[PDB]
Amino acid sequence: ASEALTMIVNLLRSQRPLQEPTVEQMRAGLEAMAQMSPLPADVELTTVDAGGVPGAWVRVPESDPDRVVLYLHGGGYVIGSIRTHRDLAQRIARAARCRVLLIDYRLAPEHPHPAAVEDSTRAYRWLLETGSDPKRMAIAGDSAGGGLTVATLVALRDAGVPLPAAAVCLSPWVDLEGIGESMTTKAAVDPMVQREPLLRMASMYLAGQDPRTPLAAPLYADLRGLPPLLIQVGTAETLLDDSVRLAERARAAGVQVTLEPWEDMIHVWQAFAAMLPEGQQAIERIGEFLRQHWQ
C-alpha cells in the first residue's frame, strides 16, 4: 500500500475516535478530525427539510441535476453528521457526476433503532415525491451507514416502493454482535474498529432489541430483489467479514453484487482521500460503478 497509509494509521491509532469516554466526546472528536480535510470552494451545500428529516444537498460543478445519491453517513448509528461526511459526499458527487442528498438521520442513544431506518426511507420517499426517478438514483453509505443502506433497500422493497438503480456500501457494519472471524483475526491491524466499541454502539442503537433484528443487522434480512450492489472493504479491517458475509447473503438472494476487497486498506479509507491515493482511487471506482448503472 502507499506509504500514506502509515500516516493515516498513525493518526487513527492516536485519535482513537471510537474510544472517547462519552458519546459527546466521540461526536466532537469525529467533527474535529473531519475539519482537517480541505472542503473545495466549488462545492455548493443547500440545507433542506427532506420530508421531515434534515438534509443537505451537495452539488459540484459537473453534477447532473437529475441524478441523485441518498448518502447515509457512518458513525455506529451514534456519531457522525452532515459536517463529518460532507467531504466524502462531495467527492462522490464529483466522481459520479451527480447530486448527493446527505441526511441527518436520527442518532442513538437518543433515538434508537428503528429511527435511522424510518428517516432513511422517509428521505428516499421524499426524493420520489419531489420528482427524482429511481433509475437515476442510488443509495450509498459507509460503516453503520452501509448497513443502513441495505436495511433501507429492504424496507423500501417491502413497502412496494420502487428501488433505485444501484447501491454502494463502504465497509458496511451488518453484524451487531461482532462474531465474524475477522473481528478476531484483523484486530491487530485495524487502527479504528474493535469489538468493544462496536458492542457499545450496538447497545445504544438496539436499546435491548434482538441484535439479529433484520433492519438493524441486515445480515439477517431478506435481500431478494435488491438492485446492483458495490461493496468496498479493506483487508485490514475487523469488519472485513461483514462485507464477505453480506456479499454471500446478497448473491444467494440473486442480487448482482460486486465485492471489492482493497488490500491493506483500513476502515472507510475513502474518507482520507485528500491524503491517501487509494481513497481517491476507490472513490473514482464508486463513480464509475454508479455511472454504469445509470446508463
Side-chain angles (χ1 to χ4, degrees), residues 75-112:
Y77 298 104
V78 174
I79 75 178
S81 70
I82 289 169
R83 287 153 295 287
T84 60
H85 283 70
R86 59 186 173 198
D87 182 61
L88 186 53
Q90 70 85 14
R91 296 179 181 275
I92 291 169
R94 192 180 300 277
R97 296 188 285 268
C98 67
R99 300 193 289 160
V100 174
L101 181 65
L102 181 63
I103 64 164
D104 186 37
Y105 63 84
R106 277 174 291 161
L107 299 173
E110 293 85 346
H111 304 117

Short mmCIF file of all heavy atoms in Angstrom, two decimals, residues 75-112:
data_model
loop_
_atom_site.label_atom_id
_atom_site.label_comp_id
_atom_site.label_asym_id
_atom_site.label_seq_id
_atom_site.Cartn_x
_atom_site.Cartn_y
_atom_site.Cartn_z
N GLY A 75 -20.71 6.11 11.54
CA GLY A 75 -20.65 6.53 12.92
C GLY A 75 -21.36 5.64 13.91
O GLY A 75 -21.76 6.07 14.98
N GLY A 76 -21.53 4.36 13.58
CA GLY A 76 -22.02 3.40 14.55
C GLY A 76 -23.49 3.55 14.94
O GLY A 76 -23.91 2.96 15.94
N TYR A 77 -24.24 4.36 14.17
CA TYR A 77 -25.61 4.77 14.49
C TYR A 77 -25.69 5.79 15.63
O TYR A 77 -26.77 6.14 16.06
CB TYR A 77 -26.55 3.59 14.73
CG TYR A 77 -26.72 2.68 13.55
CD1 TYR A 77 -26.11 1.44 13.47
CD2 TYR A 77 -27.53 3.07 12.48
CE1 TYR A 77 -26.31 0.60 12.39
CE2 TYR A 77 -27.73 2.24 11.40
CZ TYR A 77 -27.14 1.00 11.35
OH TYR A 77 -27.41 0.18 10.26
N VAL A 78 -24.52 6.25 16.09
CA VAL A 78 -24.39 7.09 17.28
C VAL A 78 -23.71 8.44 17.02
O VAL A 78 -24.09 9.43 17.61
CB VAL A 78 -23.62 6.30 18.37
CG1 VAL A 78 -23.32 7.13 19.59
CG2 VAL A 78 -24.40 5.07 18.76
N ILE A 79 -22.72 8.46 16.13
CA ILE A 79 -21.96 9.65 15.82
C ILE A 79 -22.02 9.94 14.31
O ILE A 79 -22.73 9.25 13.57
CB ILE A 79 -20.51 9.58 16.38
CG1 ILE A 79 -19.60 8.66 15.59
CG2 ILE A 79 -20.54 9.20 17.85
CD1 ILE A 79 -18.18 8.65 16.12
N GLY A 80 -21.30 10.97 13.89
CA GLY A 80 -21.34 11.44 12.53
C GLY A 80 -22.42 12.45 12.33
O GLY A 80 -23.38 12.55 13.09
N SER A 81 -22.30 13.21 11.24
CA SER A 81 -23.18 14.32 10.97
C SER A 81 -22.97 14.78 9.53
O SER A 81 -22.09 14.31 8.82
CB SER A 81 -22.89 15.49 11.90
OG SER A 81 -21.64 16.05 11.57
N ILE A 82 -23.75 15.79 9.14
CA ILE A 82 -23.52 16.47 7.88
C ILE A 82 -22.09 17.01 7.82
O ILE A 82 -21.45 16.99 6.77
CB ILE A 82 -24.59 17.55 7.61
CG1 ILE A 82 -25.92 16.85 7.29
CG2 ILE A 82 -24.16 18.56 6.55
CD1 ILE A 82 -27.13 17.77 7.27
N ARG A 83 -21.59 17.54 8.94
CA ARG A 83 -20.23 18.06 8.96
C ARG A 83 -19.17 16.99 8.77
O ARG A 83 -18.16 17.22 8.12
CB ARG A 83 -19.97 18.86 10.23
CG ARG A 83 -20.67 20.21 10.25
CD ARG A 83 -20.98 20.73 11.65
NE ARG A 83 -21.95 19.86 12.30
CZ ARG A 83 -23.24 19.81 11.95
NH1 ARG A 83 -23.73 20.65 11.05
NH2 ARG A 83 -24.03 18.91 12.51
N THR A 84 -19.36 15.81 9.37
CA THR A 84 -18.31 14.81 9.28
C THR A 84 -18.19 14.22 7.87
O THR A 84 -17.09 13.86 7.45
CB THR A 84 -18.46 13.68 10.29
OG1 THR A 84 -19.68 12.98 10.12
CG2 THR A 84 -18.41 14.21 11.71
N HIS A 85 -19.32 14.14 7.16
CA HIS A 85 -19.39 13.40 5.91
C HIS A 85 -19.62 14.25 4.68
O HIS A 85 -19.69 13.70 3.58
CB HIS A 85 -20.40 12.26 6.03
CG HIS A 85 -19.87 11.09 6.78
ND1 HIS A 85 -19.64 11.12 8.15
CD2 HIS A 85 -19.52 9.86 6.34
CE1 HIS A 85 -19.16 9.94 8.50
NE2 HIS A 85 -19.11 9.14 7.43
N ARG A 86 -19.68 15.58 4.81
CA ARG A 86 -19.89 16.41 3.64
C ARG A 86 -18.74 16.29 2.64
O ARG A 86 -18.95 16.39 1.43
CB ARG A 86 -20.23 17.86 3.99
CG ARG A 86 -19.21 18.56 4.79
CD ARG A 86 -19.69 19.96 5.22
NE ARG A 86 -18.71 20.54 6.13
CZ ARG A 86 -18.91 21.55 6.97
NH1 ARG A 86 -20.07 22.19 6.96
NH2 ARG A 86 -17.93 21.90 7.79
N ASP A 87 -17.52 16.06 3.12
CA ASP A 87 -16.38 15.92 2.20
C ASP A 87 -16.48 14.62 1.39
O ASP A 87 -16.31 14.60 0.18
CB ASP A 87 -15.04 16.01 2.90
CG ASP A 87 -13.89 15.92 1.92
OD1 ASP A 87 -13.85 16.82 1.03
OD2 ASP A 87 -13.12 14.94 2.00
N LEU A 88 -16.76 13.52 2.07
CA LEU A 88 -16.95 12.28 1.34
C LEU A 88 -18.11 12.43 0.33
O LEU A 88 -18.02 11.97 -0.81
CB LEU A 88 -17.17 11.12 2.31
CG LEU A 88 -17.24 9.75 1.73
CD1 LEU A 88 -16.06 9.42 0.85
CD2 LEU A 88 -17.31 8.73 2.84
N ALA A 89 -19.20 13.07 0.76
CA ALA A 89 -20.33 13.31 -0.12
C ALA A 89 -19.96 14.08 -1.38
O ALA A 89 -20.32 13.69 -2.48
CB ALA A 89 -21.45 14.00 0.63
N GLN A 90 -19.18 15.15 -1.23
CA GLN A 90 -18.83 15.96 -2.40
C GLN A 90 -17.90 15.16 -3.31
O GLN A 90 -17.97 15.27 -4.54
CB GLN A 90 -18.27 17.34 -2.03
CG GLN A 90 -16.89 17.38 -1.39
CD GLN A 90 -15.72 17.39 -2.37
OE1 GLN A 90 -15.92 17.62 -3.58
NE2 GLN A 90 -14.52 17.21 -1.87
N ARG A 91 -16.99 14.38 -2.73
CA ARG A 91 -16.10 13.56 -3.56
C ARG A 91 -16.89 12.57 -4.39
O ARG A 91 -16.56 12.33 -5.56
CB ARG A 91 -15.03 12.84 -2.73
CG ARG A 91 -14.08 13.78 -2.03
CD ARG A 91 -13.05 13.04 -1.20
NE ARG A 91 -12.16 13.98 -0.53
CZ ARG A 91 -11.10 14.48 -1.10
NH1 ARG A 91 -10.68 14.09 -2.31
NH2 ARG A 91 -10.43 15.40 -0.46
N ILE A 92 -17.92 11.96 -3.81
CA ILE A 92 -18.76 11.03 -4.55
C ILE A 92 -19.56 11.79 -5.62
O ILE A 92 -19.66 11.32 -6.76
CB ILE A 92 -19.65 10.22 -3.59
CG1 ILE A 92 -18.76 9.25 -2.80
CG2 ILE A 92 -20.73 9.49 -4.35
CD1 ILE A 92 -19.42 8.56 -1.64
N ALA A 93 -20.13 12.94 -5.26
CA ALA A 93 -20.84 13.78 -6.22
C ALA A 93 -19.97 14.08 -7.43
O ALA A 93 -20.43 14.05 -8.56
CB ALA A 93 -21.28 15.08 -5.59
N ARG A 94 -18.69 14.37 -7.18
CA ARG A 94 -17.75 14.75 -8.22
C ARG A 94 -17.41 13.55 -9.11
O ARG A 94 -17.38 13.65 -10.32
CB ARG A 94 -16.51 15.34 -7.56
CG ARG A 94 -15.52 16.05 -8.42
CD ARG A 94 -14.35 16.56 -7.57
NE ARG A 94 -14.74 17.50 -6.51
CZ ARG A 94 -14.94 18.81 -6.65
NH1 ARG A 94 -14.79 19.40 -7.82
NH2 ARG A 94 -15.30 19.53 -5.62
N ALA A 95 -17.19 12.39 -8.51
CA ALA A 95 -16.81 11.19 -9.26
C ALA A 95 -17.98 10.62 -10.05
O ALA A 95 -17.83 10.19 -11.19
CB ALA A 95 -16.21 10.15 -8.34
N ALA A 96 -19.16 10.63 -9.44
CA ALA A 96 -20.38 10.11 -10.07
C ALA A 96 -21.11 11.14 -10.92
O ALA A 96 -22.07 10.81 -11.57
CB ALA A 96 -21.30 9.58 -9.00
N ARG A 97 -20.66 12.40 -10.86
CA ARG A 97 -21.26 13.50 -11.60
C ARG A 97 -22.76 13.59 -11.33
O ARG A 97 -23.60 13.61 -12.22
CB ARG A 97 -20.90 13.43 -13.08
CG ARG A 97 -19.39 13.60 -13.31
CD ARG A 97 -18.91 13.74 -14.72
NE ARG A 97 -18.89 12.53 -15.52
CZ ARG A 97 -17.88 11.67 -15.68
NH1 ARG A 97 -16.75 11.74 -14.99
NH2 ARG A 97 -18.05 10.67 -16.55
N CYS A 98 -23.09 13.68 -10.04
CA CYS A 98 -24.45 13.69 -9.56
C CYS A 98 -24.58 14.64 -8.38
O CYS A 98 -23.59 15.18 -7.89
CB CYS A 98 -24.88 12.28 -9.15
SG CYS A 98 -24.01 11.64 -7.70
N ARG A 99 -25.82 14.83 -7.93
CA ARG A 99 -26.09 15.46 -6.67
C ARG A 99 -26.14 14.41 -5.57
O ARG A 99 -26.50 13.26 -5.82
CB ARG A 99 -27.44 16.18 -6.68
CG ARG A 99 -27.57 17.29 -7.71
CD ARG A 99 -28.79 18.16 -7.43
NE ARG A 99 -30.02 17.42 -7.72
CZ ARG A 99 -31.22 17.71 -7.25
NH1 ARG A 99 -31.38 18.70 -6.38
NH2 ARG A 99 -32.27 16.98 -7.62
N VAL A 100 -25.78 14.80 -4.35
CA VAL A 100 -25.89 13.95 -3.19
C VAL A 100 -26.82 14.60 -2.20
O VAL A 100 -26.66 15.77 -1.87
CB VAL A 100 -24.50 13.66 -2.58
CG1 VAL A 100 -24.63 12.89 -1.28
CG2 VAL A 100 -23.63 12.89 -3.55
N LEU A 101 -27.77 13.82 -1.66
CA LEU A 101 -28.58 14.27 -0.54
C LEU A 101 -27.98 13.58 0.70
O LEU A 101 -28.10 12.37 0.88
CB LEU A 101 -30.05 13.90 -0.70
CG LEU A 101 -30.92 14.38 0.45
CD1 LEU A 101 -31.02 15.89 0.56
CD2 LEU A 101 -32.31 13.76 0.39
N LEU A 102 -27.34 14.39 1.56
CA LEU A 102 -26.71 13.89 2.77
C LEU A 102 -27.65 14.18 3.93
O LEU A 102 -27.84 15.34 4.29
CB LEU A 102 -25.39 14.65 2.93
CG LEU A 102 -24.49 14.33 4.09
CD1 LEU A 102 -24.01 12.91 4.01
CD2 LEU A 102 -23.31 15.27 4.01
N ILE A 103 -28.23 13.13 4.53
CA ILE A 103 -29.25 13.30 5.54
C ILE A 103 -28.71 13.17 6.96
O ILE A 103 -27.81 12.39 7.28
CB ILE A 103 -30.47 12.38 5.32
CG1 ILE A 103 -30.13 10.91 5.44
CG2 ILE A 103 -31.14 12.72 3.99
CD1 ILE A 103 -31.34 10.02 5.61
N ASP A 104 -29.33 13.95 7.84
CA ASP A 104 -29.09 13.89 9.27
C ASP A 104 -30.10 12.96 9.92
O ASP A 104 -31.03 13.41 10.58
CB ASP A 104 -29.14 15.29 9.85
CG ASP A 104 -28.76 15.33 11.27
OD1 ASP A 104 -27.86 14.58 11.68
OD2 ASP A 104 -29.30 16.15 12.01
N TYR A 105 -29.95 11.65 9.69
CA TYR A 105 -30.87 10.69 10.27
C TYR A 105 -30.71 10.67 11.81
O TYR A 105 -29.64 10.97 12.37
CB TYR A 105 -30.69 9.31 9.64
CG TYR A 105 -29.33 8.66 9.85
CD1 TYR A 105 -29.07 7.95 11.02
CD2 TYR A 105 -28.34 8.71 8.89
CE1 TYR A 105 -27.86 7.34 11.21
CE2 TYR A 105 -27.13 8.12 9.09
CZ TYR A 105 -26.88 7.41 10.25
OH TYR A 105 -25.68 6.78 10.47
N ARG A 106 -31.78 10.32 12.48
CA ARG A 106 -31.76 10.29 13.93
C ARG A 106 -30.73 9.33 14.48
O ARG A 106 -30.60 8.23 13.99
CB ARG A 106 -33.16 9.93 14.44
CG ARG A 106 -34.08 11.11 14.50
CD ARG A 106 -35.51 10.74 14.86
NE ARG A 106 -36.14 9.98 13.80
CZ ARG A 106 -37.21 9.22 13.94
NH1 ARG A 106 -37.81 9.09 15.11
NH2 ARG A 106 -37.68 8.54 12.91
N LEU A 107 -30.00 9.79 15.50
CA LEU A 107 -28.93 9.05 16.13
C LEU A 107 -29.33 8.50 17.50
O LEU A 107 -30.08 9.13 18.25
CB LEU A 107 -27.66 9.91 16.27
CG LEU A 107 -27.08 10.38 14.93
CD1 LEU A 107 -25.94 11.35 15.16
CD2 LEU A 107 -26.60 9.21 14.09
N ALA A 108 -28.73 7.35 17.81
CA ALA A 108 -28.77 6.71 19.11
C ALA A 108 -27.65 7.30 19.95
O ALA A 108 -26.69 7.84 19.41
CB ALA A 108 -28.56 5.22 18.93
N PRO A 109 -27.68 7.20 21.30
CA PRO A 109 -28.73 6.57 22.09
C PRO A 109 -30.03 7.34 22.19
O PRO A 109 -31.02 6.75 22.63
CB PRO A 109 -28.08 6.50 23.48
CG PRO A 109 -27.14 7.66 23.52
CD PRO A 109 -26.58 7.72 22.12
N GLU A 110 -30.05 8.60 21.79
CA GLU A 110 -31.25 9.42 21.96
C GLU A 110 -32.45 8.82 21.22
O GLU A 110 -33.58 8.81 21.72
CB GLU A 110 -30.99 10.84 21.44
CG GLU A 110 -29.96 11.62 22.24
CD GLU A 110 -28.51 11.42 21.87
OE1 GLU A 110 -28.19 10.46 21.15
OE2 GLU A 110 -27.69 12.24 22.34
N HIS A 111 -32.19 8.31 20.00
CA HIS A 111 -33.22 7.81 19.11
C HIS A 111 -32.80 6.43 18.62
O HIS A 111 -32.09 6.31 17.62
CB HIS A 111 -33.44 8.76 17.94
CG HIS A 111 -33.78 10.13 18.37
ND1 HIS A 111 -33.03 11.26 18.12
CD2 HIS A 111 -34.81 10.53 19.14
CE1 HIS A 111 -33.64 12.30 18.67
NE2 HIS A 111 -34.70 11.88 19.31
N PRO A 112 -33.18 5.36 19.33
CA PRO A 112 -32.74 4.02 18.95
C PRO A 112 -33.39 3.51 17.66
O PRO A 112 -34.35 4.09 17.14
CB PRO A 112 -33.19 3.15 20.14
CG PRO A 112 -33.58 4.06 21.21
CD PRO A 112 -33.87 5.39 20.63
#
